[PDB]
Each structure stands twice: as C-alpha cells, then as structure tokens.
Amino acid sequence: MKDRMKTVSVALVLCLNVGVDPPDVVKTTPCARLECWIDPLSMGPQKALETIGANLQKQYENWQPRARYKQSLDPTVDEVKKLCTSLRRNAKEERVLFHYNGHGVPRPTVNGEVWVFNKNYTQYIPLSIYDLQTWMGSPSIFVYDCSNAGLIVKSFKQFALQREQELEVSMKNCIQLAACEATELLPMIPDLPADLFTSCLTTPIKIALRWFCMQKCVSLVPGVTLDLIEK
Amino acid sequence: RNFLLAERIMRSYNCTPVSSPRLPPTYMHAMWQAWDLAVDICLSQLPTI
Amino acid sequence: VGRLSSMNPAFVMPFLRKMLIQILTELEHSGIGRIKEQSARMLGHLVSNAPRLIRPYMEPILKALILKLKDPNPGVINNVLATIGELAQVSGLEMRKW
Amino acid sequence: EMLVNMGNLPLDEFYPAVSMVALMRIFRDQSLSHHHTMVVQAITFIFKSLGLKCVQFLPQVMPTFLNVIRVCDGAIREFLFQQLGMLVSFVKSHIRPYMDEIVTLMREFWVMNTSIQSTIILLIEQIVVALGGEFKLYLPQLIPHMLRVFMHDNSPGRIVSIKLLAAIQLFGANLDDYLHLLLPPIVKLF
Amino acid sequence: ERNVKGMFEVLEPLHAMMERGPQTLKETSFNQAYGRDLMEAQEWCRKYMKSGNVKDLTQAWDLYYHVFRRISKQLPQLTSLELQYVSPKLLMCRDLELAVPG
C-alpha cells in the first residue's frame, strides 16, 4: 500500500455564542444541554468557551496526536481566513480536518453560509465556502454538526459544480460527515448529549453504553443504572 | 468506524446522517446483535464488581 | 437451534436472545388468548432445549410468569404452570426465593 | 386583578392574556356546558394566532382542559378531541409533560363506536408528528386497542381500519420493536 | 513599612486554610484552581517571611498580583452555587432531630 498523506490539523470552528439562543429555536426546561460532557449553564460563561475547545482536541488526540490543532471560538471571516489558509499553507497535499458546530448560530442558508461576526448578535455572514472549495481543493475532511448538514453537503455539490463550470476552461475526493440530512432537525430530548454526532465520532463507547441502558422495556439484567456504566 | 454506530442511534431517532462517498446502509446487520450480547454478558457482573 | 447452541454459538446465541426479548414483550402486551397462549408455550419449549442460555437472566422471566399466574380459557395458566416446572428443574439451587 | 395585570404590562401581551384570564373563569364552570364550542374555538383561534406566543398559557389551560374533557358530555366530548388535536399541532414538543394524561383519555374512551374511532384515529397523527421519535413510550398502551379493532371493525369494508392502514405508515423507526405483533393482521387482510 | 500585617499574617495562614478546609471539605481540585497559582505566589511569600530578602517580596507580590487579577474577573460573575460543591457533606443531611432554625 502506497499513499501516506496523514492529517495536517483540526480547524475546530467552534461557533457557539454561549447562552445566546439562535432565534430559530424555542427550548423547553427538559433540554438537551451537555457538550463534550460539560454543561456551560452551570459554569463560568465566557471562560468555559475556551475549555470545551481544549477538551475536544484532547478527545481527537486519542484517535491521532501526530497532527496539530487550533481552537477557533466564534470566528469571523478574517479569523476563518487566517486559521484555514495558515494551516493549509504549512502542507498542501496533506489532509486538513475541517470541523464545525452550528450553535448560537441560525440554520445554514440555501447557499451554505454562517452567522458570526465579533460575537455581536448571531450576526449573518457569508461563509466564503466557494473559496474554502480551493483551500480544501487538495485532500481534506469535513464534519458538519448542525441542524441541516445535508443542505451544506447538497450546496457544496452546487458550489463544486460551479467549480466544474470554471474547470471546463479533484472535484471532491475530500471526506464529509453530516450530522443530519437537509430536511431533518436535531433532537431536543434532555437524555441526549447535544453534540451527538461529534460525541459519537469522538467517544463511541460512552454513547453506546449510555444509549444501550435506556433502550429495552424489561431489563433482563435488572441491577444496571447510568451510575454504574460511569464506573 | 464510529460512523456506523452513529447510523444506528440516529435511525433510533429521526436522523439519517450522510457521507461524502455513496455508502450502502448497515444498521440492520446480524453482527450488531453479537455486540449487544457481549455488552449484556459484561454488565451482568458490574452490579457486584 | 436449541440443540446446535453447543456447537456454533456465534450465529446461534444472539439470534436466540433477540427471540427471547420479542417473546417477553409479547407476553407483556398481548391482549389476545391465542397469542398469550402461544407465547408461554414457545418460552417453555425453548428453556430446556438450550438451558445454558436462561441461567444468566431467569429472574425477570420468573417475575413475569408469577404475574400471569396472579390474574386471568385456562390453557394459558396451564402452559405457565408447565413452564415453572421445567424452569425449576433446570435452575436447581438458584430457585430458593419464590 | 386587572389593575395589577394591566399595571405590569406592555400593551400587546395583555390583550390575549386578559382574553385568556377572562375565558378561563368560564372554563372552570358548568356554564361551559352551554358555551363549550365558543370558549374552546376562541382558545383555538387565540393559540393559532400566536404559535410560540401561547406556550406560556399551557400551565393554566391544559390541565383545566383535560379536567373539562374527562367531565364533558360524550356527544360534545367527541368534538373536544378535534380541538385538542389542533392545540397539539400548534404546541409541538412543549406538550411532553401532559402526554401521560392525554394517552389515558385515549385508553379510557375507545370502543366499537364509529365517531370516537375516526376522530381518535386522526388525533394520533398529530401526537405522532409532535412526538416524531419520543412516541414509543406510549405506543404499547395503544397496541391493545389497535390489534383488536384491526381484526373486528364492523364497518363496511373495515373503513376506519383502511384509515389506520395509512396512519401506521407515519410511525417509521419508533415502531421498530413491535413489528412482530403488528405484521400478521395485515397479512391476513391482504 | 508595616510588612507583617499583610504578607506574613494573612498570606501563609490563608493558603494553609485553603490546603485544609476547602482542599478537603470542599471540592479539592476546583478550589485548588485558584489555590495552585496562589500556591506559587505562597512559596515566594514563605521565602520572604523568614529571609527578609527584598527580591522574595517583589516575586511574592507580582505572582500574587497575577492570580489576584484572575480572581478579580471571577468574583464579579459567580452567582448561584451547587450546595454539595459548596461542601460535599452539605446538601446531604435530611429529616433531622432538629426544629427549624430558632
């Protein structure tokens, strides 16, 4: 076997605007709240926004530490440009890891865009996704933890087809993982970690056990509780 | 590898997560029941351990 | 399959386990005589044919059987009685509580 | 309470809020046995006109409405279930905590009767699209009415069973454990 | 020039009364989240207490200024506190041999 392009680094464009409800949503008291098994509501608000970024990196380091990490907190287009282009410039043929979360940030647009500027008010911003399409034109991977990720993937095909409609003068080798299909919207059952797709891609065992213990309707082993599968 | 585990839980709920390449479905496969037996065997003991 | 359970466990064992939960669910939520009766029959029929499989989680089977005895064609109670008989015969010392 | 209530508020909210409070005193009384349609349809129209902005009235309205339904005279209680349906499709996930009682009413009042059958066979689908995954906790409470009537519906061509044959298609993943119970009655029918 | 009143009297007894007390009968590690930088300033303070070397003084103070500046941003924005994290024996007593407080 020949090819050994490893990974460059993880973008961790952790767009959360902690505590600010993206006005699309209405919660309920029984709310899905946890992310990377931390609750920000019961923690130091603007401080804890750093902690989760380091936590997520340390989980990815279990799956591979021989590649880098920038913890990118509510970044505006300029911040995004700096993050992605600097890392890509260090190694071009190597795999970049695009990773995102769509929190304190409304649903993605029909044309694949985002909602952050100077952490002002969940501020609409064009994501420069059709430029990212050459920043990621050489090998990369993408993860989209958001309420309509299949829309991001579909629109990525429409922009990639617009790249073809120039290239007529690597369409997408690069990997993509979508937390739901375009039509869907994420669950709100409080028994779920909120970053569920990431939480699976990052900590499958905790998920599997915490899923498992709820599912059946007579517990053929009856002694088990949440409390023990922690231990 | 974790993506297949995701496909299971997501189809438990109302999600159908999707991939760059055009994968065939997996959620049904008999080997999953081998997983679930292995967990039950394990967690039969843990209430004493 | 009850018999072959000692030979090639990797295919057989899990498959059987899936049946067991499906049959307890049926026994728990069936409203019909015919299905309740067949449920209890198939359970009883299985236990002694692959006994090693029931040892590890007898107790909720037994609790369900008690609750079927406790409150009502008598054929359903007859099959549950026959099943207690087989179960105790397999179980041995484990039985002492009930 | 009005001078307190008015004394607290920006204008917009106190219009529907005073409308709600005004109606709720009648809602708590036997005179409702006359004005039922009026009060109920008024609520419906107000919730319809508000969406996100009537969730705040659930804690008063809903437990009162359940008490009304379980007290109500059958020939108009039949009608209340349609109204509860439309209240649910406005309210969505926020219905959660009452669901135990709502399912209990559907347990208590389901028999060979055509109008109860057809209205409840509809009502289900609102509960389903509100509880798109969650509904499973309640499905086993309802399998015991479904299996019976699926194989005893006296109507010409088992017509409410033909409506149930569509209704079943909604359930998708949340049906998954119980397919083993539900399939064979369909196989006999075709 | 009234040196004793601040550094000697307050600052080592302070850190000793973090190290027993809230490093045990409160959640050790997160109370030690301040305590572990208060500790590195405390070493320089303990050096100064006995030495009288005016370098140990300015080291102790600058380190203390840094953790003080961390603390200065967080005293303004703690508000509601989980009672067993307030003390792990607190919250946990129930249905007592006591009438309600006087």
Side-chain angles (χ1 to χ4, degrees), chain A, chain B, chain C, chain D, chain E residues 1-89 91-102:
Chain A
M1 179 50 77
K2 286 68 167 181
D3 292 13
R4 285 179 178 75
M5 299 82 77
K6 67 155 191 188
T7 48
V8 179
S9 183
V10 200
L12 303 170
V13 293
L14 188 52
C15 310
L16 302 184
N17 296 316
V18 58
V20 186
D21 289 7
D24 312 348
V25 174
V26 169
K27 290 171 167 164
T28 331
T29 298
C31 214
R33 278 167 281 189
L34 288 297
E35 288 182 295
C36 291
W37 307 96
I38 289 168
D39 168 31
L41 304 173
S42 56
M43 281 297 284
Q46 189 61 23
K47 164 55 211 182
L49 176 60
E50 303 177 331
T51 315
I52 289 170
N55 181 356
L56 179 52
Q57 159 171 358
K58 288 178 298 176
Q59 301 160 33
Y60 267 107
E61 288 172 357
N62 302 323
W63 305 105
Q64 244 306 324
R66 199 176 57 112
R68 291 184 292 138
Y69 299 93
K70 292 192 178 188
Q71 318 79 13
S72 309
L73 319 181
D74 303 322
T76 320
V77 186
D78 47 297
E79 318 182 55
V80 166
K81 186 199 305 179
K82 176 186 177 173
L83 289 158
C84 302
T85 67
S86 58
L87 291 171
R88 170 50 83 206
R89 275 178 276 156
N90 306 147
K92 286 77 159 186
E93 308 172 323
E94 197 89 294
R95 306 186 214 275
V96 167
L97 299 201
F98 175 84
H99 176 102
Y100 163 74
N101 186 332
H103 268 242
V105 158
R107 295 164 192 158
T109 65
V110 177
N111 302 308
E113 302 131 345
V114 75
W115 312 79
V116 196
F117 175 105
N118 281 278
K119 71 156 195 69
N120 290 348
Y121 52 81
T122 81
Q123 176 167 352
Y124 172 63
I125 279 302
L127 185 47
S128 69
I129 174 167
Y130 23 76
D131 306 332
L132 267 293
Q133 284 212 326
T134 64
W135 313 359
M136 300 271 164
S138 55
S140 77
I141 290 123
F142 295 72
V143 187
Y144 309 111
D145 193 5
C146 69
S147 296
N148 303 96
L151 196 73
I152 296 176
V153 173
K154 281 179 174 188
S155 61
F156 192 103
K157 290 307 304 187
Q158 277 78 69
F159 294 134
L161 290 166
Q162 287 180 4
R163 212 218 283 103
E164 163 59 358
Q165 294 150 7
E166 144 60 31
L167 266 43
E168 283 161 11
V169 174
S170 46
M171 262 289 278
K172 212 184 197 163
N173 309 68
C174 305
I175 300 100
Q176 292 159 287
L177 301 170
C180 82
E181 190 161 55
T183 318
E184 306 190 309
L185 297 166
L186 281 164
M188 298 290 280
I189 297 83
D191 310 276
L192 294 168
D195 56 1
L196 185 54
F197 193 59
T198 302
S199 199
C200 303
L201 286 158
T202 199
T203 42
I205 278 67
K206 292 293 186 73
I207 290 293
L209 295 168
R210 287 283 281 99
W211 178 78
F212 171 102
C213 60
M214 301 195 288
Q215 300 307 302
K216 67 215 304 159
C217 292
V218 50
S219 198
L220 269 63
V221 169
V224 172
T225 76
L226 316 182
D227 325 319
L228 308 191
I229 60 170
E230 291 165 14
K231 292 182 187 74
Chain B
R1 289 176 171 100
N2 302 180
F3 181 61
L4 297 324
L5 183 274
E7 169 168 297
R8 296 263 295 179
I9 286 96
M10 287 290 194
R11 285 187 72 136
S12 312
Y13 298 104
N14 301 70
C15 293
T16 195
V18 64
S19 53
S20 164
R22 191 171 149 234
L23 260 62
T26 70
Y27 87 98
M28 67 218 65
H29 207 246
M31 199 69 60
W32 294 116
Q33 279 175 71
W35 156 260
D36 195 87
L37 174 65
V39 178
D40 183 83
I41 283 176
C42 174
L43 303 188
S44 71
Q45 313 177 41
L46 190 63
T48 72
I49 300 161
Chain C
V1 287
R3 287 166 30 208
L4 296 179
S5 186
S6 61
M7 296 178 73
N8 180 10
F11 293 90
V12 172
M13 291 287 269
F15 183 104
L16 291 177
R17 193 187 62 111
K18 169 172 168 201
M19 306 312 300
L20 172 58
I21 290 81
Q22 289 189 351
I23 288 174
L24 299 195
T25 282
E26 167 187 69
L27 192 64
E28 185 187 327
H29 286 292
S30 300
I32 312 183
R34 169 74 275 109
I35 292 181
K36 279 191 287 188
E37 192 183 83
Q38 198 66 27
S39 193
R41 169 61 182 169
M42 196 67 83
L43 169 59
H45 178 58
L46 176 66
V47 170
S48 49
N49 279 228
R52 174 257 280 117
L53 186 53
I54 303 90
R55 295 170 193 159
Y57 37 62
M58 180 270 288
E59 312 99 314
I61 317 179
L62 205 78
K63 290 168 181 184
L65 290 162
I66 282 169
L67 292 173
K68 277 276 183 284
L69 289 169
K70 191 172 178 196
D71 199 15
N73 167 38
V76 180
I77 275 82
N78 300 342
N79 286 6
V80 174
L81 288 174
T83 304
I84 296 292
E86 272 279 66
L87 188 284
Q89 171 282 109
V90 161
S91 165
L93 172 62
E94 161 194 33
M95 284 305 302
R96 179 56 211 245
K97 321 194 184 181
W98 313 264
Chain D
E1 194 144 30
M2 181 276 289
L3 272 153
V4 190
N5 182 264
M6 185 268 279
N8 294 336
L9 274 167
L11 180 56
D12 299 352
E13 292 94 313
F14 92 66
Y15 284 133
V18 77
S19 305
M20 294 301 311
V21 170
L23 291 171
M24 282 299 105
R25 302 160 303 166
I26 297 94
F27 210 50
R28 295 157 188 173
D29 178 39
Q30 50 59 63
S31 312
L32 190 65
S33 69
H34 182 43
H35 309 287
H36 71 294
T37 36
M38 309 186 73
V39 173
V40 169
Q41 291 158 356
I43 295 155
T44 298
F45 167 71
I46 294 156
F47 277 45
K48 179 206 303 184
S49 71
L50 287 170
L52 309 178
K53 303 183 287 204
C54 65
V55 172
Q56 303 78 13
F57 304 127
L58 284 164
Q60 299 167 25
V61 172
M62 186 51 63
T64 313
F65 185 35
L66 294 172
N67 276 271
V68 165
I69 289 168
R70 205 179 266 133
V71 163
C72 197
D73 300 357
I76 59 155
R77 197 198 301 119
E78 193 290 332
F79 142 75
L80 294 186
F81 293 124
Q82 297 115 40
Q83 294 289 283
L84 181 48
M86 314 325 172
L87 287 158
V88 165
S89 60
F90 309 146
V91 163
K92 297 210 163 173
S93 67
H94 314 303
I95 193 61
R96 270 178 284 181
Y98 302 105
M99 186 51 46
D100 296 352
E101 274 285 68
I102 293 166
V103 170
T104 320
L105 275 310
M106 283 163 54
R107 295 220 87 253
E108 298 156 55
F109 300 109
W110 192 334
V111 291
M112 183 56 65
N113 175 283
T114 308
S115 55
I116 286 177
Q117 280 175 359
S118 65
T119 280
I120 291 181
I121 285 164
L122 172 60
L123 174 54
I124 283 163
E125 302 194 15
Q126 284 73 212
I127 300 169
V128 162
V129 298
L131 299 187
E134 311 94 293
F135 174 52
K136 53 168 56 169
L137 295 180
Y138 299 100
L139 181 52
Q141 297 290 2
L142 297 184
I143 289 177
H145 281 304
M146 300 154 81
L147 284 177
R148 273 182 271 162
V149 170
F150 197 100
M151 283 174 292
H152 294 301
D153 175 3
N154 268 228
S155 65
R158 303 152 70 157
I159 34 70
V160 292
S161 312
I162 300 183
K163 292 191 182 189
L164 176 56
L165 253 168
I168 280 163
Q169 297 180 35
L170 278 61
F171 305 171
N174 65 54
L175 180 57
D176 174 48
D177 277 355
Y178 298 84
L179 176 52
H180 74 273
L181 287 173
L182 270 292
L183 176 60
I186 301 155
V187 186
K188 286 202 288 183
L189 180 57
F190 82 74
Chain E
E1 301 175 349
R2 72 193 92 78
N3 295 29
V4 313
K5 290 177 168 72
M7 303 157 303
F8 310 167
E9 294 280 25
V10 189
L11 301 182
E12 175 46 30
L14 272 198
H15 191 69
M17 282 54 163
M18 305 164 204
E19 289 281 10
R20 62 170 196 274
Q23 261 75 87
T24 296
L25 304 177
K26 201 175 176 310
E27 311 301 67
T28 302
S29 52
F30 96 70
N31 271 90
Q32 183 63 1
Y34 302 112
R36 65 194 67 250
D37 194 1
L38 294 165
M39 180 278 139
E40 202 57 43
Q42 168 251 24
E43 171 66 19
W44 279 97
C45 181
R46 276 194 285 92
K47 289 181 183 184
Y48 185 56
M49 275 174 66
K50 300 198 173 74
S51 72
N53 293 25
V54 184
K55 183 55 175 183
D56 301 355
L57 167 70
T58 187
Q59 269 288 14
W61 273 118
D62 197 49
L63 292 176
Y64 269 125
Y65 276 29
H66 309 326
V67 61
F68 154 75
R69 282 162 186 167
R70 182 157 83 258
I71 295 160
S72 295
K73 289 170 288 182
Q74 308 318 327
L75 265 281
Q77 55 189 15
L78 62 97
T79 63
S80 189
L81 318 175
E82 156 53 37
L83 184 56
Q84 86 204 266
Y85 305 163
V86 162
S87 173
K89 307 203 295 174
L91 182 65
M92 314 326 295
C93 62
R94 309 291 160 91
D95 55 287
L96 293 172
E97 306 181 69
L98 268 172
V100 169

